[PDB]
Amino acid sequence: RGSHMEDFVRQCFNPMIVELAEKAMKEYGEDPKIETNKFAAICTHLEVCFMYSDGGSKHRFEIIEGRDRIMAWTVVNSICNTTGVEKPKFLPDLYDYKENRFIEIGVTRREVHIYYLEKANKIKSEKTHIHIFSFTGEEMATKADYTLDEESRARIKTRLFTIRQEMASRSLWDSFRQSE
Amino acid sequence: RGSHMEDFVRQCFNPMIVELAEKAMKEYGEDPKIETNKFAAICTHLEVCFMYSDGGSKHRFEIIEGRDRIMAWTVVNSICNTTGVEKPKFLPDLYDYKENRFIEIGVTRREVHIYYLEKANKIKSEKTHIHIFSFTGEEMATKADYTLDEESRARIKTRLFTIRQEMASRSLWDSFRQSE
Amino acid sequence: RGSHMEDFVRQCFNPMIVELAEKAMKEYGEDPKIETNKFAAICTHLEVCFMYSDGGSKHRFEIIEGRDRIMAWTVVNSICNTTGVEKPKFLPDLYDYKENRFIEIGVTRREVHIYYLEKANKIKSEKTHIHIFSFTGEEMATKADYTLDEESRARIKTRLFTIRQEMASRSLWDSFRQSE
Amino acid sequence: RGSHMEDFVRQCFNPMIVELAEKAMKEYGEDPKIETNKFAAICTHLEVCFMYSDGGSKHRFEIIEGRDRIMAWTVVNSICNTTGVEKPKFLPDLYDYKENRFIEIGVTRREVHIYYLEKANKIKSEKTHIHIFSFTGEEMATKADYTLDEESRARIKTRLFTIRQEMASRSLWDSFRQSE
Amino acid sequence: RGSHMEDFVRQCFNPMIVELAEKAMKEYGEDPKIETNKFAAICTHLEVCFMYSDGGSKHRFEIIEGRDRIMAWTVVNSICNTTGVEKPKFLPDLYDYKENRFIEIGVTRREVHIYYLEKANKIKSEKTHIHIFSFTGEEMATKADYTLDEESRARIKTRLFTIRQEMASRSLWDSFRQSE
Amino acid sequence: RGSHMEDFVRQCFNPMIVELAEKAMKEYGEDPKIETNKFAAICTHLEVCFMYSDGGSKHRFEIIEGRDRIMAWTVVNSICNTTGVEKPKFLPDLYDYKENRFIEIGVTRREVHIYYLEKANKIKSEKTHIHIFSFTGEEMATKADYTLDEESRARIKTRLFTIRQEMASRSLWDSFRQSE
Amino acid sequence: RGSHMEDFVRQCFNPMIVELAEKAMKEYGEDPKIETNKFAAICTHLEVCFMYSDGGSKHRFEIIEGRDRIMAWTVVNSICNTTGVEKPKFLPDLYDYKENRFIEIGVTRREVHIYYLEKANKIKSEKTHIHIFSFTGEEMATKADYTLDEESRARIKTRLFTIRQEMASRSLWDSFRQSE
Amino acid sequence: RGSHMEDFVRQCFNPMIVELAEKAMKEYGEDPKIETNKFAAICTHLEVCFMYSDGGSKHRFEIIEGRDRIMAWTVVNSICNTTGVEKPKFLPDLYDYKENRFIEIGVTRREVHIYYLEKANKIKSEKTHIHIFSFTGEEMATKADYTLDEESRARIKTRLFTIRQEMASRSLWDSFRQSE
Ligand SMILES: COc1cc(CCNC(=O)c2[nH]c(-c3c(F)cccc3F)nc(=O)c2O)ccc1O
Ligand SMILES: COc1cc(CCNC(=O)c2[nH]c(-c3c(F)cccc3F)nc(=O)c2O)ccc1O
Ligand SMILES: COc1cc(CCNC(=O)c2[nH]c(-c3c(F)cccc3F)nc(=O)c2O)ccc1O
Ligand SMILES: COc1cc(CCNC(=O)c2[nH]c(-c3c(F)cccc3F)nc(=O)c2O)ccc1O
Ligand SMILES: COc1cc(CCNC(=O)c2[nH]c(-c3c(F)cccc3F)nc(=O)c2O)ccc1O
Ligand SMILES: COc1cc(CCNC(=O)c2[nH]c(-c3c(F)cccc3F)nc(=O)c2O)ccc1O
Ligand SMILES: COc1cc(CCNC(=O)c2[nH]c(-c3c(F)cccc3F)nc(=O)c2O)ccc1O
Ligand SMILES: [Mn+2]
Ligand SMILES: [Mn+2]
Ligand SMILES: [Mn+2]
Ligand SMILES: [Mn+2]
Ligand SMILES: [Mn+2]
Ligand SMILES: [Mn+2]
Ligand SMILES: [Mn+2]
Ligand SMILES: [Mn+2]
Ligand SMILES: [Mn+2]
Ligand SMILES: [Mn+2]
Ligand SMILES: [Mn+2]
Ligand SMILES: [Mn+2]
Ligand SMILES: [Mn+2]
Ligand SMILES: [Mn+2]
């Protein structure tokens, strides 16, 4: 399956992020060589989660996304059993040691408005914080609490718009947008 | 001596921490292949001491634990002979340059209450600060002065509860708990 | 699933071999955390294939085992389309540039006699060379042509018997033997 | 073309900075082996841009200089399309996430006065911030807003005067000064 | 210029080979982003030259291809001025210290027959040895002297056919073949 | 010249510090194999200078000690020609970009009182700041301005007393003390 | 215990060899800080064993010396159980895959004559090969079969005489010689 | 002393060879910044000695050149005291374990004829082998025994002629030739 999207994903994202998105997709019964648009989505969501944890302090964030299903749930139990936050129903992306809450990071191709509502209806735990990023440069967080400073968030938006530009340069953006 | 506990310890802790706990046990006439529960304890105590010094400033802590007996006592003399703190009777774990005191780090499987009293009766030097961590997520420090920020301490509790979970997953926690 | 076998496999084989055996099992719908005996078999077979290619000359062997299914078949086509050997029905392990033939490497827990016959009935291509190794130290190759020198083969047998010893030391050999 | 200036440039600046200045010159139809004085200028301007971004915070600056023409313009579009700053007519050197503006870094051999006016007449976008450095130790920024702290700027002036000293020691400064 | 061929070239060949082919093309006034088929050809020819020198002894071959124009001609002069071979009119790829002759390596998409004749008419120096490789697996050398052993040459043919397969998988082979 | 002191110096200080002290001594016509006590002094003074610059900010200090005579004077000229401080008569150890002054670091075996007076009479430039450290743990700076925080200075005193302890353990301290 | 011999051993032998000799001595109830002459002997014997295995082919030798007691005996069992050689009574140093025999390497300070007889009376297994080296440059092997080529053995003798020279330069050779 | 020759030497030879030639010159009371032609000679002679030892077998040559005066004489004593060759009056460059003799490597700018006679009159030990290389490509060894194979020697001549070309390109060859 010689897909242009797959070759672009492998040259756009670092090898370690590509390997993690490939392990995550294969675990859930998805083929990155065939589900090439979703392949680009898992990498993008992974990178955003990594830059997000790169903002703030060194011991500030515990990274849940990127681990295997069993170990990610193991760290979630340890965080709940030492701090006291309720165990979320769905796997979140990070945990904020500064604010004592889980973070669900979203990357959308539509307006940040519908996606957050979609993620807020899924997350029954009202404690879990939600932060949505768009490929257009718009963002949206729970209670207008954007956690990070403006410049760590600005770096993420700039990166998201560069991925869009490179996709549109290869005529792959249109399929990517009409795929979410 | 093919012990499950030993194989789990070697895959749970980093090689450098394993090598240090092995050198420390052999020096005191203990075999890590036979004293496998204590082997897990020396590694756990070592890691906690390392994360503890990772909190705070770069030049903040002097690490006493993890060295050989003679060199650890050499650094203790140098700290006493330049700052003026009294020479402790027993080897401590760290020295706080910010607060000018030695720190005795404890990791217990019972309630933090009995362990601290056990360590407070041993440490005749009332100057030495005591900080106890539990596998349940509870902590306890001298004069309620927990030295580090809440999040550096939270990371240690989360790690301690993950070690417990992995031990219980392998049916090794019960023997570990009824061993201290 | 806290399995002693899994923890022993991760400490017995190098991380890169473990990662390859995990990718290979997951691709064929197998869980290394549950199929722990087979997990030890894929690692052992992988290592033997790597030591086998380490024998002989630098450009002598092309390693087919250890790649993903599609790329392994891609290299097989390239070898057939430049040398002229017939395309094998099943994926082999190596290709010998010195002798111009594919090699099927076997690692068995029974007598090398039954396993080779089992592999000779499967391999319809009589051109493909077969080389069987046992955990007891016995070996068996097609037409008594053992390809490598005696000492490269001796190193593989010694390694296979060390894996057996470590397994029996942990009381895991009996389950491993009655599992093939 | 055995030029003393070229050999001094290769031993004065790090290899990565030399490689970038060589790629930048060749793209614009310039030969570093013949345009040896300009070769020293591109390296010097590159280093100053790198030390400038080394000042301040980790996520503070986005480095535009040093990339190829197409990618540098790609990051500029992403910054404009997520923050809202106007697209500059000419390629700048950095973007300040803290102050939300592009920075044009200048390194001159004359008085900082004429060079800034020369760069202020070229930059039609009044939003773009201008910061000029001289080989004599003088500096000059837009609205007297020097962005960085005094010591990050002091390190750049010291480096610029060391390059001058090494050039004059090799009797290459006079040609370099009468070349801008 | 979002070209599928360019993204495939960057993921097919190692970064160091890609960087060398990019420097070589830009020097001769060629854009790898636009001349994407030739971009794949320079990388392929470079790799073949590197594997070719990897065959034989350690001090056997002097690599001429891959250097800048001036330095490649400098090494050619040094080889002629110490051994005595005539200075070739055109830049060759290697020099054989074992056989005391220059080697011109060719990689063609047509039959090895026409390409060698094309290269034999260009190379006036009858001393220079010619070795042609095809993407089909055929090879052809001067005086039937193929220099290397069969297996070093076999590895090159296998690699050439894998590049073809990956190109055809992405529907890029047809344009590549009808481009030489 | 098999000196115990030389073998202890090579095992006490890191190789890079040893190499710098050896280059510095040989430049001034001193043999580290014969002047073994001074060899220990140059290493100790070098390390203290390096830990001192490790305190404070990243761009805070410019390290003058440890360079060759000509380059150290080159950086001194650049600092004077961009900030405006007077050119010191003797080579200092550091420059403070935060406080805009040169620092002369001293390590003595007698009382800090006589050494500073000895260094204050030599340094005609009253602008240059003086900071003296002793092997007993006492320190002494110009105008009681100790530049660094207490804990960066405490780390230096602890290290100095450990060097003393290791020297006295090998019966080399007495010769070292009666040598300054 | 500030011993000159210990400081010389740490600067004469590489850190990895020093760490192995320290682990070996501590396991057998010996202190390298007190048994400093034997400390030099374990390092010397270890290095000679490593250079010896460095001679010959890559897969030629299996290194038994340098492992912990249990694992060294594990590899010995695997070699006996795959080749068929009798299990030696005492732990040897190497195994020769080329000649199918164990090797006992000796390093002596007396004449090679008495030491070999001392080692030949201990080794009941007449199959085990014995190879003795002296600090004077003399060697002595079983059946005059010196296994390695003359130059690999010559390198070992040269190294042994350099260790002697450095010891005598520090006036430590006399104690070392009158210690075996 | 801004010398073109010094800047060319630092960019022509690797940093490790430059550092060794600088240590060797300073030991004998020579300044590489002033004796720039000799600086180029020590580097060239060092490199040739290193390529020469790179030819042949791995354990074949013992490198005497490049060490400090005392250690080089220490290895010479060890070689004489284990093999039996007479102690040379002057420090040689290598020792051949294959042929059991010392090698004096020469690099000359005149005809190899006069230089060898100059070196043969100095070397009283007729046992020491002499091998002379010229910048023109001519070589000359004792008893026509050139030790290495033709291609290892050819690589050295090619390198020597490239150094000449780069020197003449910078107009530094004429001074270098009229300096020996
Ligand atoms: C079941 O879904 C899949 C999840 C994964 C790994 C990511 N794990 C998440 O939990 C997750 N997934 C998504 C998401 C999605 F919900 C739909 C489409 C694309 C996405 F990236 N957005 C998030 O923010 C987030 O945290 C791999 C394969 C899967 O099929
Ligand atoms: C003598 O005891 C031993 C100590 C060590 C190394 C640790 N050195 C300590 O000083 C230390 N030991 C312990 C501790 C304990 F007291 C009992 C059981 C397990 C422990 F980890 N807790 C600490 O907090 C602490 O600082 C190795 C082997 C020993 O037998
Ligand atoms: C479908 O089988 C599986 C194969 C693999 C990867 C190995 N690929 C092989 O082709 C292969 N497999 C086996 C083998 C086997 F046939 C049965 C049990 C265990 C084995 F290791 N022996 C070989 O020699 C060999 O080359 C992963 C998971 C699979 O389920
Ligand atoms: C077209 O000009 C060239 C630019 C470059 C790369 C640098 N890209 C810039 O945009 C740039 N150039 C300059 C500059 C200049 F304007 C004149 C002379 C020397 C200079 F360094 N100063 C800056 O501050 C700056 O940002 C390479 C080759 C070129 O010919
Ligand atoms: C001429 O003196 C020598 C200096 C050096 C390099 C150190 N360069 C200094 O300038 C310096 N020297 C000293 C010092 C001293 F003055 C006497 C004895 C020992 C010392 F370390 N203390 C400092 O604080 C300081 O900065 C190498 C060899 C020399 O003979
Ligand atoms: C029990 O002896 C000890 C052995 C070791 C590790 C070495 N293991 C050996 O088996 C060995 N020991 C010796 C040897 C000796 F026999 C006496 C004195 C010094 C020696 F190096 N020579 C060999 O050749 C050899 O192979 C560590 C501490 C020990 O006390
Ligand atoms: C005393 O001479 C010096 C030697 C050295 C280090 C090299 N050690 C040698 O022994 C040596 N020197 C020379 C040589 C020479 F004899 C004259 C001029 C240039 C040379 F490279 N050619 C050799 O082949 C050789 O082995 C450094 C500085 C010295 O002044
Ligand atoms: Mn998620
Ligand atoms: Mn998410
Ligand atoms: Mn402790
Ligand atoms: Mn403790
Ligand atoms: Mn297979
Ligand atoms: Mn197989
Ligand atoms: Mn610019
Ligand atoms: Mn600029
Ligand atoms: Mn060609
Ligand atoms: Mn100084
Ligand atoms: Mn000083
Ligand atoms: Mn032995
Ligand atoms: Mn010499
Ligand atoms: Mn010589």
PDB file of N, CA and C in Angstrom, chain H residues 43-75:
ATOM      1  N   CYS H  43      52.371  17.237  12.542  1.00  0.00           N
ATOM      2  CA  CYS H  43      51.060  16.666  12.241  1.00  0.00           C
ATOM      3  C   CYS H  43      51.154  15.657  11.105  1.00  0.00           C
ATOM      4  N   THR H  44      51.840  16.031  10.021  1.00  0.00           N
ATOM      5  CA  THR H  44      51.974  15.141   8.873  1.00  0.00           C
ATOM      6  C   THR H  44      52.686  13.853   9.258  1.00  0.00           C
ATOM      7  N   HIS H  45      53.791  13.971   9.995  1.00  0.00           N
ATOM      8  CA  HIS H  45      54.513  12.785  10.442  1.00  0.00           C
ATOM      9  C   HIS H  45      53.652  11.933  11.365  1.00  0.00           C
ATOM     10  N   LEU H  46      52.859  12.576  12.225  1.00  0.00           N
ATOM     11  CA  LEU H  46      51.983  11.835  13.127  1.00  0.00           C
ATOM     12  C   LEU H  46      50.934  11.050  12.350  1.00  0.00           C
ATOM     13  N   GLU H  47      50.246  11.717  11.419  1.00  0.00           N
ATOM     14  CA  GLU H  47      49.217  11.046  10.629  1.00  0.00           C
ATOM     15  C   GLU H  47      49.796   9.853   9.878  1.00  0.00           C
ATOM     16  N   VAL H  48      50.935  10.050   9.206  1.00  0.00           N
ATOM     17  CA  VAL H  48      51.564   8.957   8.468  1.00  0.00           C
ATOM     18  C   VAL H  48      51.855   7.786   9.396  1.00  0.00           C
ATOM     19  N   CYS H  49      52.343   8.072  10.605  1.00  0.00           N
ATOM     20  CA  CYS H  49      52.588   7.003  11.567  1.00  0.00           C
ATOM     21  C   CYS H  49      51.296   6.281  11.930  1.00  0.00           C
ATOM     22  N   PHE H  50      50.178   7.012  11.989  1.00  0.00           N
ATOM     23  CA  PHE H  50      48.909   6.395  12.365  1.00  0.00           C
ATOM     24  C   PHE H  50      48.329   5.560  11.227  1.00  0.00           C
ATOM     25  N   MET H  51      48.386   6.064   9.989  1.00  0.00           N
ATOM     26  CA  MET H  51      47.937   5.261   8.854  1.00  0.00           C
ATOM     27  C   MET H  51      48.814   4.030   8.674  1.00  0.00           C
ATOM     28  N   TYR H  52      50.119   4.175   8.912  1.00  0.00           N
ATOM     29  CA  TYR H  52      51.036   3.046   8.795  1.00  0.00           C
ATOM     30  C   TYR H  52      50.647   1.926   9.752  1.00  0.00           C
ATOM     31  N   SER H  53      50.368   2.268  11.013  1.00  0.00           N
ATOM     32  CA  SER H  53      49.914   1.260  11.964  1.00  0.00           C
ATOM     33  C   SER H  53      48.513   0.758  11.643  1.00  0.00           C
ATOM     34  N   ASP H  54      47.707   1.552  10.933  1.00  0.00           N
ATOM     35  CA  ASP H  54      46.397   1.088  10.495  1.00  0.00           C
ATOM     36  C   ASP H  54      46.502   0.003   9.433  1.00  0.00           C
ATOM     37  N   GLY H  55      47.607  -0.039   8.688  1.00  0.00           N
ATOM     38  CA  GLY H  55      47.852  -1.150   7.799  1.00  0.00           C
ATOM     39  C   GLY H  55      48.318  -2.384   8.548  1.00  0.00           C
ATOM     40  N   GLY H  56      48.146  -3.535   7.911  1.00  0.00           N
ATOM     41  CA  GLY H  56      48.503  -4.781   8.556  1.00  0.00           C
ATOM     42  C   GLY H  56      47.441  -5.248   9.538  1.00  0.00           C
ATOM     43  N   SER H  57      47.879  -6.081  10.480  1.00  0.00           N
ATOM     44  CA  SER H  57      46.977  -6.723  11.421  1.00  0.00           C
ATOM     45  C   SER H  57      46.672  -5.807  12.606  1.00  0.00           C
ATOM     46  N   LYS H  58      45.700  -6.233  13.417  1.00  0.00           N
ATOM     47  CA  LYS H  58      45.248  -5.418  14.542  1.00  0.00           C
ATOM     48  C   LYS H  58      46.299  -5.359  15.644  1.00  0.00           C
ATOM     49  N   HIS H  59      46.861  -6.510  16.014  1.00  0.00           N
ATOM     50  CA  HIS H  59      47.893  -6.589  17.038  1.00  0.00           C
ATOM     51  C   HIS H  59      49.298  -6.510  16.458  1.00  0.00           C
ATOM     52  N   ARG H  60      49.436  -6.032  15.220  1.00  0.00           N
ATOM     53  CA  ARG H  60      50.714  -6.121  14.524  1.00  0.00           C
ATOM     54  C   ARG H  60      51.706  -5.075  15.018  1.00  0.00           C
ATOM     55  N   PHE H  61      51.259  -3.833  15.175  1.00  0.00           N
ATOM     56  CA  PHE H  61      52.146  -2.715  15.461  1.00  0.00           C
ATOM     57  C   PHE H  61      51.898  -2.159  16.856  1.00  0.00           C
ATOM     58  N   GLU H  62      52.984  -1.790  17.527  1.00  0.00           N
ATOM     59  CA  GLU H  62      52.944  -1.017  18.762  1.00  0.00           C
ATOM     60  C   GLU H  62      53.377   0.405  18.435  1.00  0.00           C
ATOM     61  N   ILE H  63      52.512   1.370  18.727  1.00  0.00           N
ATOM     62  CA  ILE H  63      52.739   2.762  18.353  1.00  0.00           C
ATOM     63  C   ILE H  63      53.566   3.439  19.440  1.00  0.00           C
ATOM     64  N   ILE H  64      54.781   3.854  19.086  1.00  0.00           N
ATOM     65  CA  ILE H  64      55.650   4.567  20.019  1.00  0.00           C
ATOM     66  C   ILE H  64      55.499   6.075  19.872  1.00  0.00           C
ATOM     67  N   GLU H  65      55.417   6.563  18.637  1.00  0.00           N
ATOM     68  CA  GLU H  65      55.243   7.988  18.400  1.00  0.00           C
ATOM     69  C   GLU H  65      53.869   8.438  18.881  1.00  0.00           C
ATOM     70  N   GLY H  66      53.803   9.657  19.410  1.00  0.00           N
ATOM     71  CA  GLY H  66      52.565  10.209  19.914  1.00  0.00           C
ATOM     72  C   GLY H  66      52.412  10.161  21.419  1.00  0.00           C
ATOM     73  N   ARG H  67      53.247   9.397  22.114  1.00  0.00           N
ATOM     74  CA  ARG H  67      53.239   9.375  23.567  1.00  0.00           C
ATOM     75  C   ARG H  67      54.220  10.407  24.115  1.00  0.00           C
ATOM     76  N   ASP H  68      54.112  10.675  25.413  1.00  0.00           N
ATOM     77  CA  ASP H  68      55.100  11.526  26.052  1.00  0.00           C
ATOM     78  C   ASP H  68      56.436  10.793  26.143  1.00  0.00           C
ATOM     79  N   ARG H  69      57.505  11.576  26.316  1.00  0.00           N
ATOM     80  CA  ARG H  69      58.859  11.036  26.217  1.00  0.00           C
ATOM     81  C   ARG H  69      59.083   9.872  27.175  1.00  0.00           C
ATOM     82  N   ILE H  70      58.573   9.983  28.403  1.00  0.00           N
ATOM     83  CA  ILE H  70      58.857   8.972  29.417  1.00  0.00           C
ATOM     84  C   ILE H  70      58.100   7.684  29.122  1.00  0.00           C
ATOM     85  N   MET H  71      56.827   7.793  28.732  1.00  0.00           N
ATOM     86  CA  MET H  71      56.039   6.590  28.486  1.00  0.00           C
ATOM     87  C   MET H  71      56.474   5.894  27.203  1.00  0.00           C
ATOM     88  N   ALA H  72      56.839   6.664  26.174  1.00  0.00           N
ATOM     89  CA  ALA H  72      57.347   6.056  24.949  1.00  0.00           C
ATOM     90  C   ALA H  72      58.597   5.231  25.226  1.00  0.00           C
ATOM     91  N   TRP H  73      59.486   5.739  26.081  1.00  0.00           N
ATOM     92  CA  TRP H  73      60.667   4.969  26.453  1.00  0.00           C
ATOM     93  C   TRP H  73      60.308   3.786  27.344  1.00  0.00           C
ATOM     94  N   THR H  74      59.200   3.876  28.084  1.00  0.00           N
ATOM     95  CA  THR H  74      58.777   2.752  28.915  1.00  0.00           C
ATOM     96  C   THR H  74      58.328   1.576  28.054  1.00  0.00           C
ATOM     97  N   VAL H  75      57.514   1.844  27.030  1.00  0.00           N
ATOM     98  CA  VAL H  75      57.087   0.780  26.127  1.00  0.00           C
ATOM     99  C   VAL H  75      58.270   0.213  25.353  1.00  0.00           C
TER     100      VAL H  75
END
